[PDB]
Amino acid sequence: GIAAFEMEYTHWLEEQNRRVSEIRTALQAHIGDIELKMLVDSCLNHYANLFRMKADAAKADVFFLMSGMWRTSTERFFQWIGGFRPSELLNVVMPYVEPLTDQQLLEVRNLQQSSQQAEEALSQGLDKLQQGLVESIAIQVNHGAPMASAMENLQALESFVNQADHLRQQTLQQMSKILTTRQAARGLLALGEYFHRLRALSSLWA
Amino acid sequence: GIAAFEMEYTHWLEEQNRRVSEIRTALQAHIGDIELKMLVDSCLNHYANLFRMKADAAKADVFFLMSGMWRTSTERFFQWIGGFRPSELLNVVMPYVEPLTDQQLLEVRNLQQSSQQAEEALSQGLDKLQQGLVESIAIQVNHGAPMASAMENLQALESFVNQADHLRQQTLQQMSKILTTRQAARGLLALGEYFHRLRALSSLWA
Ligand SMILES: CCCCCCCCCCCCCCCC(=O)O
Numbered sequence: 001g002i003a004a005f006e007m008e009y010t011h012w013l014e015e016q017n018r019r020v021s022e023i024r025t026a027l028q029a030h031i032g033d034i035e036l037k038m039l040v041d042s043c044l045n046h047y048a049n050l051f052r053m054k055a056d057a058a059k060a061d062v063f064f065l066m067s068g069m070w071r072t073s074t075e076r077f078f079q080w081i082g083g084f085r086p087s088e089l090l091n092v093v094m095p096y097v098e099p100l101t102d103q104q105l106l107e108v109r110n111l112q113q114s115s116q117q118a119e120e121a122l123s124q125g126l127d128k129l130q131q132g133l134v135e136s137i138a139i140q141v142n143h144g145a146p147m148a149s150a151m152e153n154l155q156a157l158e159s160f161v162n163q164a165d166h167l168r169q170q171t172l173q174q175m176s177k178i179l180t181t182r183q184a185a186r187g188l189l190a191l192g193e194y195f196h197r198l199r200a201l202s203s204l205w206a
Numbered sequence: 207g208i209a210a211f212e213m214e215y216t217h218w219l220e221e222q223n224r225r226v227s228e229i230r231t232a233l234q235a236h237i238g239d240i241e242l243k244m245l246v247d248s249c250l251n252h253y254a255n256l257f258r259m260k261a262d263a264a265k266a267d268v269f270f271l272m273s274g275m276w277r278t279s280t281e282r283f284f285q286w287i288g289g290f291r292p293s294e295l296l297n298v299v300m301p302y303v304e305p306l307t308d309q310q311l312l313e314v315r316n317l318q319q320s321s322q323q324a325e326e327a328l329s330q331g332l333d334k335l336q337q338g339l340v341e342s343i344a345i346q347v348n349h350g351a352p353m354a355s356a357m358e359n360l361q362a363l364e365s366f367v368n369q370a371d372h373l374r375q376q377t378l379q380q381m382s383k384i385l386t387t388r389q390a391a392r393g394l395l396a397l398g399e400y401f402h403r404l405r406a407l408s409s410l411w412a
């Protein structure tokens with residue numbers, strides 16, 4: 001399952017590079033909103049596919065998915081529950097989706113605050129689960145309960161990952177409704193270049 | 207380098223199982239201190255070889271060594287800077303090295319307190335390094351400085367790992383001087399069975 005995920009993610013990155021390049025070329029050519037929206041929607045569809053493949057990987061090996069060892073070294077410094085922190089990515093793209101109207105500014109900052117609150121609450125719940133596993137493993141005839149208990153805890157860990165990816169996807173979705181097509185394209189370009197620069201830097205660390 | 211480490215560690219575990227079994231058989235046969243000390247010293251030599259292979263792996267890929275992803279899932283709940291926490295392992299073996307004399311009790315508790323203090327200080331330094339890398343990567347013509355800076359930071363991370371393994375080895379060494387051969391054998395048996403039980407439990411999580 002993890003081998004399949006790593007191959008799928010490799011191909012996902014190749015397609016990500018293409019979709020980011022396509023939107024770069026479109027912004028530079030100042031193409032109209034209709035053609036540009038197709039590229040925005042393609043980028044959004046591509047992220048949706050990432051979340052799908054991550055959900056499968058979490059079922060296959062939640063610990064590996066959580067370790068971030070499938071991402072590059074520099075990306076791991078910015079990981080929160082199996083991916084990036086949406087509240088921080090909002091700061092990354094903020095200068096590029098500007099200028100924002102007053103209403104858009106209120107909507108984006110609201111979204112950032114609510115994502116921050118959701119991230120903190122999920123982190124607190126995951127912390128409680130993890131500390132409790134530390135304590136319970138430490139204490140721990142096999143009639144089947146130990147494996148069943150392990151599967152309950154794996155399901156609980158997977159739920160945290162799923163909820164974190166849900167928050168990431170929901171934040172991307174809500175930005176796509178706040179922003180015009182052109183603002184969204186600029187934000188997606190910035191987000192894509194951010195991820196690419198982190199991966200490029202990891203090559204220097206290797 | 208990491209592929210070589212994982213193969214070396216696999217063979218290390220196979221030999222660990224043999225050395226733990228050999229000392230189990232010896233304790234049960236109530237063999238004399240001279241033959242028993244050979245088995246104690248073999249166990250100590252085997253841990254020394256673990257630290258050697260870990261030092262090579264830290265040079266090859268410090269992040270992988272630190273991730274603990276080369277250990278089994280349940281062991282990762284108990285990892286501190288690239289391995290187990292010596293102060294906690296002292297608690298694991300304490301019931302089995304008993305009865306201790308008053309002097310031995312003072313020496314062991316002293317060692318546990320000093321290891322705890324060293325662990326906290328190393329954790330604080332690693333935390334400062336890591337938070338500073340988060341901040342500096344976030345801020346970050348290439349004339350060679352970015353790679354050189356990465357190598358300085360990798361060397362600093364490797365130093366923390368090396369210092370943590372030094373503390374682990376020093377604690378094992380100092381226990382071997384406090385304890386009689388028979389107490390040491392009982393403690394090594396307990397430590398070995400502890401690690402084996404954690405690995406066995408990880409099979410249930412998989
Ligand atoms: C129309 C969108 C413009 C740009 C919006 C950026 C802010 C949304 C943050 C969520 C991005 C999700 C991608 C991360 C995937 C992962 O962590 O594995």
Ligand SMILES: CCCCCCCCCCCCCCCC(=O)O
Pocket residue numbers: 253256288289290291292295296299374375377378381382385389390391393394397
């Ligand atoms: C004579 C020794 C008796 C038993 C002493 C146990 C307490 C010492 C703790 C250090 C053990 C080191 C093994 C861990 C290796 C690792 O973390 O990678």
